[PDB]
From a paper:
However, the only member of the CX3CR subfamily, [name], recognizes its sole endogenous ligand [name] to play essential roles in the cross-talk between monocytes and endothelial cells in the periphery as well as microglia and neurons in the central nervous system. [name] participates in numerous physiological processes and is involved in many important human diseases, such as atherosclerosis, rheumatoid arthritis, neurodegenerative diseases, and cancer, making it an attractive therapeutic target. To reveal the molecular details of ligand recognition and receptor activation for [name], we solved two cryo-EM structures of [name]-[name] complexes in the ligand-free and [name]-bound states, respectively.
To facilitate the formation of the [name]-[name] complex, the [name] C terminus and the [name] N terminus were connected by a 28-residue (14 × Gly-Ser) linker. Compared to the ligand-free complex, the N terminus of the receptor moves closer to the center axis of the helical bundle and the extracellular loop 2 (ECL2) is pushed away upon [name] binding. Another conserved glutamic acid, E2797.39, that was reported to play important roles in chemokine binding also forms extensive polar interactions with H2 and the main chain of G4-V5 of [name] (30, 31). In contrast, the β-hairpin of [name] ECL2 is shorter and forms little interactions with the 30s-loop of [name]. The comparison of the binding modes of ECL2 and the 30s-loop shows that the CX3C motif fixes the 30s-loop of [name] closer to the ECL2 and would form a steric clash with the longer tip of the β-hairpins in the other CKRs.
Residue numbers in the entry:
A (entry chain E): 29 to 61
B (entry chain R): 1 to 50, 55 to 66, 124 to 410
C (entry chain C): 6 to 55, 182 to 233, 241 to 354
D (entry chain D): 30 to 340
C-alpha cells in the first residue's frame, strides 16, 4: 500500500535520523571536517 | 635618485672657482640641501652668487628658488589624492585577477605581477610625501628604503609590460610553437626572473643612497662619484624607455601585421586595449625620459644657463607628478576599455 | 608523523606530475570530426599517422594534432557532444555529390544547424571540408542542382555551384562573430589540405589568445 | 506523500559550508564515487589520468594515467582494490590499487560495448556492472572478462545506474520517459516506472533500498518506490527550468542532493520536498555529488575543475 510504504519510509528515516551527521550538528573535533 | 623630490634650493655648475677676496661673507652648505652640488660660496653683494685654496681663506676670515616649495605643497596633496584612487583601483584589480574563473593563465599572472609592481609604486609614494611635508626623515633609512621601492616598482612595471608585449607577440604570430615554448610554469619562472632582473638593475641605482638629513643623498665613493649619477641616468633611460619602445615597437607591429593577414583586425580589441595602455605609458614617461636625459647632458654643459637649469628642474618635478598620476590612471584606463572588468565593478557594487 | 610527511611528499610529487601532464595535453591541439556518415578522407589521404572514437595523432610544423572521429556513436549526439568542449576547431567533412543520393544534404544541413545551436561551441570555430569535388563535375553536368536547391537561379558552371554551396554553409553560421567558418575543397594532394588545416588551427589559436586577458 | 508528510517537522535551512577545497584537476569532472573506507574518493577528467582523493588529509594517493582521455565516468570498488572508469572508447578499464609491488597497473580492459560508457558500478569485488550508450547494460566479470548477463530491455540511451545496499539489485534510466528495474538473479525486468517527460540523468537508491530518487532535465526530482510504483513523491521548485545532472541520498535518506546545472547544487528534503540548502560554491556546471556511507562529509565535483567537500 502507498500509505504503508510511506509510513515505513518515514520510520526508517527517523530511526537513523540521529545517526546522520548532516541532519544534526556534530562537534568539529568528532568529525574530520 | 628619484631626482624629482629634493630640497634643492641653490645649484652651482657655471662658476666653481673664485679668487680669494674679502668680499666673502659666508659659505652656505648646499651639500645638505642637495649633495648633487658641493659647498657654495656667498659674497657680500647682498645676493646669492657662486675650492681647496679658497677653503683656508674662508675659515680665516670667518639658484633653484622658492618656486619648488609652493609646487611641493601642491605636489604633496597631489600624491595624496592619487594614492587613494590608485590604491583602490590596484587592490580591486588584484582581487579580480586572483578570483579568476580560468586559472593557470599566463596573461593573468603577468597582469597580476604588473599590478603588484604598480602597488609598490603606490606604497612607496606616501613615504616621499611624508618626507616632503615635514623635512624629518625616518631613522636615516626610510628615505633609502623608499627610494629602493620606487626603483624596484618602476623597473618591474616597465619589465612586466615588455614581457607581456613579447608574450602577445608570440601567442599571436608564432602560435605554431608558442604553445610549446610557454606554459603556466614557464610563465611563473619568467615572472620570477623578471623580478630578479628588476632587483639587479635597480641595485646600482639605490646601491649607494644614504638617507640625508632631509633627503636621499649618495655615498658615491671617490672612484664612482661621477659614474653613479651618469650610470643611473643612462640605465634608467636606455633600459627604461628606449629599449622597451623598440621591443614593443617590434612586437605590436608584428601582431598588427598578423591580424591584417588573418583578417582578424575586427576581433582585435584585446590587443588594442594593451596598445592604448602601452602608448599612454610612453606618453606619460616621455617627459621624464627627455628631462632626465637633458640633465645627463648638463654634465657636459648642455644647459649652462641658470634659468635653463631651473626650467629643467621644474620639468623633471612635474613629469614625475605626471608619472604618479599615470600609475593610478592605468587602472582607470583598464576600466574604461575593459569589458569584464566593468562587470566586476558592478558585481562588487 | 613520519607517515604523514611521506604521504604529503608523495602527493605533492604526483600533483606536480599531473600538472606537467596537463600542461603537455594543453600544448597539443584537439580537433573534432563530424559529418553525415562520410568522413575521415583527410586522415586517409594524410599518408601517415601515429572503439567509439578513434584518436589519430598527427604532427605538422612541430604542432601536434588530435582528431577524434565520432561517426561510430549511434546515441544522441547532444549527450556526448558537450564533453568535447575545448577543442580548437571542428572538422566537418561532407560529400559534395550527396545531394542526389537520398535527403543527405538536408540531413547535413540539420546536423550543421544543431551543431551551431548547441550553446556549447560558441568560442570554437568550425572547419568545413567539401569532399568528392573531383566527382562533382560529372555529377553536376546531368543534375541541375534544382532538386536539392529549389530556386537555385544560377548557371551550371562549377564555380557558381560551389559558390552557392559555400553560401548555404555561410547562412547556417547564425553567429558570424564568435565563430569563423573556414571552407576548403579537399583535393588529391595532401599538402594543400594539411596547409589549410594548419592555417585554420593557427587562426583559432590567435582568436583564443585574444580572450585570455584578465580584462575579459 | 505531501499530505501524509504535512505534520512532520521540516529540517529547515542548513548553513552548509565548504570544509576543504580540492584543486588537483585542470579539467571538468563528470562522475565520482565514495568508498567504503569513508576517506577516499575517485574523480576523472580530460587530463588523461585518474587520481584517488584523500578527503581527510587533502591529498592524492594515486595517479593512474588513462589510455582514453575522454573519460565520462568512474567508480571505486567497495573492497578498495579496484577502480573502474568509462570513456568514449567503449572500454571499461579496471586498475589495481597497490595490489602488487605497491604500484598501480591496469588489471583488465573490459570491452564489447558499442555505445559510449556513461556509468559503471562495482556490484561486487569480482563482478562489475556498466551502463553504455547503446541502450544495453552489461554485467562483466574481471576473471573472465565477458558479459555474464546482458540486458536489452530499454529503448533509449541509458545514462546512469546505482547499486542497492544488498548488492543484488540495480536500475538505470534512459532518454525515454520509462525506467524499469532489473534483477540480477531473475535476469529480467520486474517493475516498470513511468511519469517522466524528458531524459533521465541521475539515479541513486534510497539507503533503505525500497525506493530511489531520479532527476530529469526538466528541473524535477521524482521518488519511485517498490510498493506504490506510482511516483508517490515528486519534487519541484517552479523557479528554474535547467536540468538535473547528479542526485544522491544522505545516510538516513532524510536529506537529498540535486546536481542542478545552474552553477550550484540544490539540497532538498526526501519527504518534506522543500528547499533546505544551496551550495553555490561552484563557478561552473556541476555534475558530481555523493554522500559518504557514514555521512561525515559530502563531496561535490563540478566543471570548474575544482572539487569541494561539505561537512
Ligand atoms: C625592455 C627590457 C628593458 C626588458 C628586459 C627583457 C628580459 C629581462 C626578459 C625577456 C625574456 C625573459 C626570459 C625568458 C625566459 C626565461 C626562462 C625562465 O625559466 C627563467 C627566466 C627567463 C630567463 C626570462 C628572464 C628575463 C628575460 C630575459
Ligand atoms: C627597430 C625598428 C626597426 C622597429 C620599427 C617598427 C615600426 C615600423 C612599427 C612600430 C609600431 C608600428 C605601428 C603600430 C600601429 C599601426 C596601426 C595600424 O593600423 C597600421 C600600422 C601601424 C601604423 C604600425 C606600423 C609600423 C610600426 C610604426
Amino acid at each position: 500500500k502507498v500509505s504503508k510504504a510511506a509510513a515505513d519510509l518515514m520510520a526508517y528515516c527517523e530511526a537513523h535520523a540521529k545517526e546522520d551527521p548532516l541532519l544534526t550538528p556534530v562537534p568539529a573535533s568528532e568529525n574530520p571536517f | 635618485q628619484h631626482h624629482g623630490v629634493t630640497k634643492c634650493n641653490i645649484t652651482c655648475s657655471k662658476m666653481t672657482s673664485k679668487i680669494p677676496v674679502a668680499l666673502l661673507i659666508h659659505y652656505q652648505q648646499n651639500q645638505a640641501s642637495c649633495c648633487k652640488r658641493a659647498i657654495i660660496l656667498e659674497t657680500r653683494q647682498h645676493r646669492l652668487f657662486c675650492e681647496q685654496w679658497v677653503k683656508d681663506a674662508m675659515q680665516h676670515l670667518d639658484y633653484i628658488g622658492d618656486i619648488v616649495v609652493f609646487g611641493t605643497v601642491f605636489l604633496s596633496i597631489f600624491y595624496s589624492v592619487i594614492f587613494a584612487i590608485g590604491l583602490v583601483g590596484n587592490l580591486l584589480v588584484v582581487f579580480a585577477l586572483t578570483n579568476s574563473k580560468k586559472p593557470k593563465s599566463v596573461t593573468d599572472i603577468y597582469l597580476l605581477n604588473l599590478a603588484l609592481s604598480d602597488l609598490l609604486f603606490v606604497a612607496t609614494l606616501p613615504f616621499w610625501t611624508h618626507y616632503l611635508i615635514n623635512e624629518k626623515g625616518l631613522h636615516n633609512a626610510m628615505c633609502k628604503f623608499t627610494t629602493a621601492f620606487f626603483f624596484i616598482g618602476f623597473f618591474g612595471s616597465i619589465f612586466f609590460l615588455t614581457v607581456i608585449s613579447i608574450d602577445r607577440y608570440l601567442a599571436i604570430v608564432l602560435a605554431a610553437n608558442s604553445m610549446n615554448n610557454r606554459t603556466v610554469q614557464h610563465g611563473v619562472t619568467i615572472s620570477l626572473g623578471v623580478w630578479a632582473a628588476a632587483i639587479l638593475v635597480a641595485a646600482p641605482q639605490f646601491m649607494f643612497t644614504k638617507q640625508k638629513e632631509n633627503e636621499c643623498c649618495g655615498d658615491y665613493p671617490e672612484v664612482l662619484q661621477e659614474i653613479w649619477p651618469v650610470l643611473r641616468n643612462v640605465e634608467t633611460n636606455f633600459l627604461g624607455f628606449l629599449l622597451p619602445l623598440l621591443i614593443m615597437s617590434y612586437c605590436y607591429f608584428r601582431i598588427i601585421q598578423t591580424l591584417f593577414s588573418s583578417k582578424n583586425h575586427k576581433k582585435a580589441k584585446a590587443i588594442k586595449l594593451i596598445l592604448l595602455v602601452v602608448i599612454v605609458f610612453f606618453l606619460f614617461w616621455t617627459p621624464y625620459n627627455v628631462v632626465i636625459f637633458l640633465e645627463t647632458l648638463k654634465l657636459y654643459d648642455f644647459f649652462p644657463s641658470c634659468d635653463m637649469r631651473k626650467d629643467l628642474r621644474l620639468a623633471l618635478s612635474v613629469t614625475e607628478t605626471v608619472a604618479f598620476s599615470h600609475c593610478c590612471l592605468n587602472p582607470l584606463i583598464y576600466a574604461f576599455a575593459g569589458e569584464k572588468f566593468r562587470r566586476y565593478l558592478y558585481h562588487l557594487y | 608523523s613520519a607517515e604523514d610527511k611521506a604521504a604529503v611528499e608523495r602527493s605533492k610529487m604526483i600533483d606536480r606530475n599531473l600538472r606537467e601532464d596537463g600542461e603537455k595535453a594543453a600544448r597539443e591541439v584537439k580537433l573534432l570530426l563530424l559529418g553525415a556518415g562520410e568522413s575521415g578522407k583527410c586522415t586517409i589521404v594524410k599518408q601517415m599517422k601515429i572503439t567509439g572514437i578513434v584518436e589519430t595523432h598527427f604532427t605538422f610544423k612541430d604542432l601536434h594534432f588530435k582528431m577524434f572521429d565520432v561517426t561510430a556513436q549511434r546515441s544522441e549526439r547532444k549527450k556526448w557532444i558537450h564533453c568535447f568542449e575545448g577543442v580548437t576547431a571542428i572538422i566537418f567533412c561532407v560529400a559534395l555529390s550527396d545531394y542526389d543520393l537520398v535527403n543527405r544534404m538536408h540531413a547535413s544541413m540539420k546536423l550543421f544547424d544543431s551543431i551551431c545551436n548547441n550553446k556549447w561551441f560558441t568560442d570554437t570555430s568550425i572547419i568545413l571540408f567539401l569532399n568528392k569535388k573531383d566527382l562533382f563535375e560529372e555529377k553536376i553536368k546531368k543534375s541541375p542542382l534544382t532538386i536539392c536547391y529549389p530556386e537555385y537561379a544560377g548557371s551550371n558552371t562549377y564555380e557558381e555551384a560551389a559558390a552557392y554551396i559555400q553560401c548555404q554553409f555561410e547562412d547556417l553560421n547564425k553567429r558570424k562573430d564568435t565563430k569563423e567558418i573556414y571552407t576548403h575543397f579537399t583535393c588529391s594532394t595532401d599538402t594543400k589540405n594539411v596547409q589549410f588545416v594548419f592555417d585554420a588551427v593557427t587562426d583559432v589559436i590567435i582568436k583564443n589568445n585574444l580572450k585570455d586577458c584578465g580584462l575579459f | 506523500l505531501s499530505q501524509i508528510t504535512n505534520n512532520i517537522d521540516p529540517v529547515g535551512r542548513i548553513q552548509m559550508r565548504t570544509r576543504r577545497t580540492l584543486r588537483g584537476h585542470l579539467a571538468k569532472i563528470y562522475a565520482m564515487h565514495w568508498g567504503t573506507d569513508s576517506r577516499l574518493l575517485v574523480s576523472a577528467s580530460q587530463d588523461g589520468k585518474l587520481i584517488i582523493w584523500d578527503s581527510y588529509t587533502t591529498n592524492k594517493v594515486h595517479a593512474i594515467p588513462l589510455r582514453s582521455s575522454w573519460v565520462m565516468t568512474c567508480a571505486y570498488a567497495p573492497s578498495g582494490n579496484y577502480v573502474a572508469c568509462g570513456g568514449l572508447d567503449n572500454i571499461c578499464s579496471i586498475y589495481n590499487l597497490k595490489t602488487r609491488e605497491g604500484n598501480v597497473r591496469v588489471s583488465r580492459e573490459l570491452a564489447g560495448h558499442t555505445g559510449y560508457l556513461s556509468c559503471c558500478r562495482f556490484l561486487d569485488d569480482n563482478q562489475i556492472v556498466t551502463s553504455s550508450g547503446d541502450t544495453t547494460c552489461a554485467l562483466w566479470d574481471i576473471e573472465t572478462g565477458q558479459q555474464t548477463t546482458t540486458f536489452t530491455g530499454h529503448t533509449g540511451d541509458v545514462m546512469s545506474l546505482s547499486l542497492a545496499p544488498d548488492t543484488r539489485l540495480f536500475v538505470s534510466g534512459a532518454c525515454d520517459a520509462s525506467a524499469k528495474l532489473w534483477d540480477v538473479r531473475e535476469g529480467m525486468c520486474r517493475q516498470t516506472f513511468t511519469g517522466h517527460e524528458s531524459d533521465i540523468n541521475a539515479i541513486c537508491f534510497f539507503p533503505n533500498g525500497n525506493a530511489f530518487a531520479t532527476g530529469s532535465d526538466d528541473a524535477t526530482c521524482r521518488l519511485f518506490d517498490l510498493r506504490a510504483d506510482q511516483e508517490l513523491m515528486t519534487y519541484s521548485h517552479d523557479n528554474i527550468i535547467c536540468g538535473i545532472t547528479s542526485v544522491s541520498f544522505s545516510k538516513s535518506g532524510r536529506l537529498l542532493l540535486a546536481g542542478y546545472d545552474d552553477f550550484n547544487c540544490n539540497v532538498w528534503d526526501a519527504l518534506k520536498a522543500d528547499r533546505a540548502g544551496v551550495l553555490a560554491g561552484h563557478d561552473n556546471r556541476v555534475s558530481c555529488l555523493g554522500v559518504t556511507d557514514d555521512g561525515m562529509a559530502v563531496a561535490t565535483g563540478s566543471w570548474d575543475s575544482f572539487l569541494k567537500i561539505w561537512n
